[PDB]
Amino acid sequence: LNDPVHYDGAWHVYKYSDVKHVLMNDKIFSSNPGNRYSGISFITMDNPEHKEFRDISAPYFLPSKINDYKDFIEETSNDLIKNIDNKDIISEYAVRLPVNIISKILGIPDSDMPLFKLWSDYIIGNKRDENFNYVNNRMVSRLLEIFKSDSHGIINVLAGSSLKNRKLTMDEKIKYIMLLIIGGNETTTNLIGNMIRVIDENPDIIDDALKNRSGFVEETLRYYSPIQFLPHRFAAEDSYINNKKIKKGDQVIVYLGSANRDETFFDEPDLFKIGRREMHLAFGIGIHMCLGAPLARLEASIALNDILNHFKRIKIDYKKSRLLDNKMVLGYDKLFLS
Ligand code: HEM
Numbered sequence: 573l574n575d576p577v578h579y580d581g582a583w584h585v586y587k588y589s590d591v592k593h594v595l596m597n598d599k600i601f602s603s604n605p606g607n608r609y610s611g612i613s614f615i616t617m618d619n620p621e622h623k624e625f626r627d628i629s630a631p632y633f634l635p636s637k638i639n640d641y642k643d644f645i646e647e648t649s650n651d652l653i654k655n656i657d658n659k660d661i662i663s664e665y666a667v668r669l670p671v672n673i674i675s676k677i678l679g680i681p682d683s684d685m686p687l688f689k690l691w692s693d694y695i696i697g698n699k700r701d702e703n704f705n706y707v708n709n710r711m712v713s714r715l716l717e718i719f720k721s722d723s724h725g726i727i728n729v730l731a732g733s734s735l736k737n738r739k740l741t742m743d744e745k746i747k748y749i750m751l752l753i754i755g756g757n758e759t760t761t762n763l764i765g766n767m768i769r770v771i772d773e774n775p776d777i778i779d780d781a782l783k784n785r786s787g788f789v790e791e792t793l794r795y796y797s798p799i800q801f802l803p804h805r806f807a808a809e810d811s812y813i814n815n816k817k818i819k820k821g822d823q824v825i826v827y828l829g830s831a832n833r834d835e836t837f838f839d840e841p842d843l844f845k846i847g848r849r850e851m852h853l854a855f856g857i858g859i860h861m862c863l864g865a866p867l868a869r870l871e872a873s874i875a876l877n878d879i880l881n882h883f884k885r886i887k888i889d890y891k892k893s894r895l896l897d898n899k900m901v902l903g904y905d906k907l908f909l910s
């Protein structure tokens with residue numbers, strides 16, 4: 573790991589302290605592409621305005637509140653992890669679980685999930701075709717309708733809403749939900765594929781994991797950061813990082829992945845020591861920290877369990893399995909067993 577160097581048009585950051593710092597300072601390192609680049613919603617939103625948007629759904633992902641789904645999840649997990657044998661664990665499980673838990677928490681039927689996950693998948697760079705233009709269309713439409721429908725799920729909560737001295741825009745409302753869809757349908761799928769990996773490579777940590785199904789997850793998030801790095805950050809004013817002068821505008825590429833391996837922070841980082849006493853910037857840190865953090869921690873845990881209690885041993889047929897090849901995120905595209 574070295575000092576942030578400027579190349580290809582942006583400084584890269586691989587040290588927990590500098591990363592943790594680049595994020596913690598959002599007034600200086602605007603999480604917003606002031607100019608234009610083209611995730612949406614309040615994730616590319618800034619300091620003062622940011623909070624106003626994040627507020628709306630904000631109370632719905634609080635530990636106490638998400639756990640108010642504790643059963644439904646394990647409910648869903650069971651049916652999924654029931655057969656799903658010899659089958660692609662990713663497609664048929666890791667995908668199905670969060671694509672469900674979120675669809676419901678939001679208002680998305682069991683009929684739109686195929687479309688939607690299929691949608692996001694394009695957004696987060698995991699499949700590209702000309703066929704995308706009418707998925708975006710073929711979906712926003714489906715979304716546009718759900719706002720009408722009813723319930724009291726996030727979407728309805730977003731529907732008749734607004735805040736401050738303005739009424740939230742419809743497109744603003746759409747993008748808002750698109751933010752939670754790209755958060756729920758994705759990234760969670762990998763923290764599951766990465767715990768399994770941990771098992772293929774470290775065969776006898778099982779019995780401890782069971783005992784501490786949480787610290788285990790919590791660890792996987794440090795060892796195999798689902799999201800390898802955040803690319804969209806830019807200098808809003810001239811500042812430093814170590815002994816580097818960032819020019820106002822300068823793109824700031826903060827590599828989370830590495831930061832979780834920083835040696836100056838984690839004793840024998842490289843190992844899977846469970847229970848370490850330091851937080852991992854996997855879910856980031858700051859005003860922009862993952863609002864879905866509490867959500868995944870559970871889904872992770874429940875499944876971790878559902879999994880282990882369903883498979884004697886755990887080998888990963890690699891002649892069939894392949895890790896997505898998108899350097900920004902770490903996870904399996906296909907993972908098969910035995
Ligand atoms: C398991 C994989 C997950 C990882 C590793 C992950 C990681 C992160 C990180 C690091 C950020 C902040 C990026 C930044 O600073 O700009 C973020 C933001 C966010 N994540 Fe995730 N996430 C995960 C799961 C979820 C889930 C399930 C949801 C649920 C819908 C979700 C919704 C969001 C939202 C809405 C934000 C942005 C909040 C804001 O703008 O401040 N995430 N996530």
Ligand SMILES: c1ccc(-c2cnc[nH]2)cc1
Pocket residue numbers: 611612615696751754755756758759862
């Ligand atoms: C674009 C927008 C949001 C996300 C995301 C963050 N946390 C989970 N998903 C990933 C790409």
